């Protein structure tokens, strides 16, 4: 009978709990109190981009800190020139139920996927000058929730049918499959060295995956509800999560525990996206009460607020060099700040 | 100006992009956006027939009005995380089968799902059409199987005219938004055009009431 599982599962769970509690000497707050407060930070709308006619669901910064891409519930994918607001390319989609986009590190490829259970790959450097499709990746049985690039020939994908799978764009067949989640999977984020990636799902759990061995290694828990967005801290040895609990958290990849939490009573709605500043000193957490906040990472105090949107914020990103910030929202206006 | 002959052609391109983005953002306001729900019985297929992978979209034209129906029966994943993509639909289209009153486990499930959808925060102002299917088998089963099986508290005679019309009171009493939305019930006369003509007439009521709420006349 399956009763023989209970004892072993209990002992291993208690062993992991005891280890994680024994390695918890002191919190991040205790040693950080000595550094000076950042004070009050003000930013202003140095630019504003217009042209989508519906809600906006994702965005990704280019690699040279000047271009970016965004996709909306209309069948439109558009690349902006962020300096002079010129539109560079506008790409018509197949299925209007869009939820993801990504920019290649070489800035040559762009990817998209939606409710049709398929992820597509586009070629920005043709000899006719117009974007074309090169591959369609099929094999999931749930909505596609995230996607990232390793290089020009390896893309990672994530779906709500509990299965994350690493692919090879050249042939079209997945060359690994990651399993272990019980519910829908919502986000993933690579490592700076491009050998790992973490993910978060509706189970209220986060799992670290070895890209090459194809096997899970570590699990992080502590959120009270579903998890919406995830980001990987710029050193490469931490990441931060955002949930529908109206709370965000910082996790560590070396001592295996939650480090810090950022929560305030005046917010009852849940976080939609999370991203980091270039020194790791700021955390720009978009929210559901129609505006975006700013949190100092080390001390958890909130420096300021960017409030220029008339609806829920859905996607934000910090540039590669550190100049600016961009945010999108369901009101169809992308605003560049600085 | 302070623009070179290069950068002065990188703004004509960005204008010529919008001159084609708008011409195709207004073409998408001439179509009617209808959702569909219910159990996956045979009713759906016949309904699509008489109107002539993860999402299936059907289109049909009738009296110069184009509808598009997003049958979401192919997803089978957690509903709370993709339902809001369908905000701003014109009208829902429900589906119910009469014959399943005794199989009364099926009836309670349909009632529970009707209750669950109606009070969503994303669907406060959407008009719910409701169809009713399998009258032919219902009238033959009721002649031997009493309605007391599904509803023991039925104090009525259980005659055919007094039986089939008892369900609608229980269906349309579930609405908690009487002042904003209304059920437009029907009996599926599968042999004639009244299946789709009823939808055509039932859409204009809410179109007009929404116009009369926008201009302020209400």
């Amino acid at each position: 009978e399956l009763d023989q599982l209970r004892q072993e599962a209990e002992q291993l769970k208690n062993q992991i709990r005891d280890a994680r509690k024994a390695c918890a000497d002191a919190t991040l707050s205790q040693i950080t109190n000595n550094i000076d407060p950042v004070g009050r930070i003000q930013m202003r709308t140095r630019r504003t981009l217009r042209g989508h006619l519906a809600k906006i669901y994702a965005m990704h910064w280019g690699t040279d800190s000047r271009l970016l891409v965004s996709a909306s519930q209309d069948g439109k994918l558009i690349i902006w020139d962020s300096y002079t607001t010129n539109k560079v390319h506008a790409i018509p989609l197949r299925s209007s139920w869009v939820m993801t986009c990504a920019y290649a590190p070489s800035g040559n490829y762009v990817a998209c996927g939606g409710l049709d259970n398929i992820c597509s790959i586009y070629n920005l450097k043709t000899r006719e000058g117009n974007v074309r499709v090169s591959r369609e990746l099929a094999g999931h049985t749930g909505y596609l929730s995230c996607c990232r690039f390793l290089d020009d020939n390896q893309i990672v994908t994530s779906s709500g049918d509990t299965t994350c799978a690493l692919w090879d764009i050249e042939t079209g067949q997945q060359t690994t499959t990651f399993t272990g989640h019980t519910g829908d999977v919502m986000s993933l984020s690579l490592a700076p060295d491009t050998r790992l990636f973490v993910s978060g799902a509706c189970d209220a759990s986060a799992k670290l995956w070895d890209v090459r061995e194809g096997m899970c290694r570590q699990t992080f828990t502590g959120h009270e509800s579903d998890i919406n967005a995830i980001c990987f801290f710029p050193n490469g040895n931490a990441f931060a999560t955002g949930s529908d609990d109206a709370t965000c958290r910082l996790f560590d990849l070396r001592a295996d525990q939650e480090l810090m939490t950022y929560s305030h009573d005046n917010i009852i709605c849940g976080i939609t996206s999370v991203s980091f500043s270039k020194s790791g000193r700021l955390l720009l957490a978009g929210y559901d009460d129609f505006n975006c906040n700013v949190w100092d990472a080390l001390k958890a105090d909130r420096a300021g607020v960017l409030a220029g949107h008339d609806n829920r914020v859905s996607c934000l990103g910090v540039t590669d060099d550190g100049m600016a910030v961009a945010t999108g929202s369901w009101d169809s206006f992308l605003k560049i700040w600085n | 100006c302070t623009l070179s002959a290069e950068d002065k052609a990188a703004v004509e391109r960005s204008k010529m992009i919008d001159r084609n983005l708008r011409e195709d953002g207004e073409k998408a306001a001439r179509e009617v956006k209808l959702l569909l729900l219910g159990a996956g019985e045979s009713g759906k297929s016949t309904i699509v027939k008489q109107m002539k992978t993860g999402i299936v979209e059907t289109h049909f034209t009738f009296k110069d009005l184009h509808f598009k129906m997003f049958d979401v029966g192919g997803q089978r994943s957690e509903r709370k995380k993709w339902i809001h993509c369908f905000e701003g639909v014109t009208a829902i289209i429900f589906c119910v089968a009469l014959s399943d009153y005794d199989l009364m486990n099926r009836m309670h499930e349909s009632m529970k799902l009707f209750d669950s959808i109606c009070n969503n925060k994303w669907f406060t102002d959407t008009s719910i059409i409701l169809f009713l299917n399998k009258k032919d088998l219902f009238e033959e089963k009721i002649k031997k199987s009493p309605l007391t099986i599904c509803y023991p508290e039925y104090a009525g005679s259980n005659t055919y005219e007094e039986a089939a019309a008892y369900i609608q009171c229980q269906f349309e009493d579930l609405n908690k938004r009487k002042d904003t939305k209304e059920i437009y019930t029907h009996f599926t006369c599968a042999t004639d055009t009244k299946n789709v003509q009823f939808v055509f007439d039932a859409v204009t009521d809410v179109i007009i009431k929404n116009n009369l709420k926008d201009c302020g006349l209400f």
Partner: single-chain antibody, 232 residues
Framework: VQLVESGGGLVQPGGSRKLSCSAS????????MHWVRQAPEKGLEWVAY????????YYADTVKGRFTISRDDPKNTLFLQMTSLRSEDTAMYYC??????????????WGQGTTLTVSSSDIVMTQATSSVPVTPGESVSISCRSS???????????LYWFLQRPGQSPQLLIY???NLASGVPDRFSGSGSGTAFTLTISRLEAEDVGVYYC?????????FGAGTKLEL
């Protein structure tokens, strides 16, 4: 990708004619188009322009009131209509696509060109070298000079280096000073500052023999230097 054009022939001076180019695939409906020229045994010259969507149209100081340009966007056909020709217009015409958006590479495909022979305030550029002989394997350098600065507030240096191997139409090498064109062997490069610029070829090969040109594109008028020639 192809550009093909036809027409030309013998023309009585003062007459009228037309030249047209056909694009194969190539999405001719999205590219700003020029028509660049060169006289027999002279440097490259410039004629006309037509932007995307039949809008912006510029002209050279000599062609302003004699020729008209137009694109048949549906059928992907480009025209130039000629009136009142004289002896000064006998030359070759080279349809040249271009792509103006951030990060692009203008002037990156010449058509095959067409012969036309008649019957019988601008930034100046100069380059003094001509027919210099060098043995292969050794490094070489070429330089042309500008009458005014080409660097800009935006930082781009609007100088081009093209190559015309004998018998062939030009092909882009250096679309801006620090940037080269794809499909070209890596051995070429370029450097320069202020109002003086110099080209370098690292490892001279058999096919590098040909004439070169340099172009300024800082503001509208488009001026070409003389034709330097390398020799084996």
């Amino acid at each position: 990708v192809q550009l093909v054009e036809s027409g030309g022939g013998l023309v009585q001076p003062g007459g009228s004619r037309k030249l047209s180019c056909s694009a194969s695939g190539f999405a001719f409906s999205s590219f700003g188009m020029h028509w660049v020229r060169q006289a027999p045994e002279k440097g490259l010259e410039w004629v006309a322009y037509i932007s995307s969507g039949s809008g912006t149209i510029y002209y050279a100081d000599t062609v302003k009131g004699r020729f008209t340009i137009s694109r048949d966007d549906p059928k992907n056909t480009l025209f130039l209509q000629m009136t009142s020709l004289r002896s000064e217009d006998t030359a070759m015409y080279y349809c040249v696509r271009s792509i103006y958006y951030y990060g692009s590479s203008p002037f990156d495909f010449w058509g095959q060109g067409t012969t036309l022979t008649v019957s019988s305030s601008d930034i100046v550029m100069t380059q003094a070298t001509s027919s210099v002989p060098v043995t292969p394997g050794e490094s070489v350098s070429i330089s042309c000079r500008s009458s005014k600065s080409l660097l800009h507030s935006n930082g781009n240096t609007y100088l081009y280096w093209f190559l015309q191997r004998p018998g062939q139409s030009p092909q882009l090498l250096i679309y801006r000073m620090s940037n080269l064109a794809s499909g070209v062997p890596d051995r070429f490069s370029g450097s320069g500052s202020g109002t003086a610029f110099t080209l370098t070829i690292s490892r001279l090969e058999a096919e590098d023999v040909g004439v070169y040109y340099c172009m300024q594109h800082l503001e509208y008028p488009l001026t070409f230097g003389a034709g330097t020639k390398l020799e084996l």
